[PDB]
Amino acid sequence: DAEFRHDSGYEVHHQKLVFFAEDVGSNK
């Protein structure tokens, strides 16, 4: 199940980094 929870938290990871990059990046 490696690649399983990998890609899963892989795109979701991008989700969190995109959120913070939106607030923090917007005013960074």
Swiss-Prot record:
It is found in: Cell surface. Changing E22Q: In CAA-APP; Dutch type. Changing Y10F: 60-70% zinc-induced amyloid-beta protein 28 aggregation. Changing R5G: 60-70% zinc-induced amyloid-beta protein 28 aggregation. Cu(2+) 2 binds at H6, Y10, H13, H14. Changing E22K: In CAA-APP; Italian type. Changing V24C: Causes formation of an artifactual disulfide bond with PSEN1. Glycans are attached at Y10. The record marks D1, A2, D7, S8, K16, L17, F19, F20 as: Cleavage. Interacts with S100A9. This is Amyloid-beta protein 40. It comes from Homo sapiens. The lineage of its organism: Eukaryota, Metazoa, Chordata, Craniata, Vertebrata. The chain holds residues 672 to 699 of 770 of the full protein.
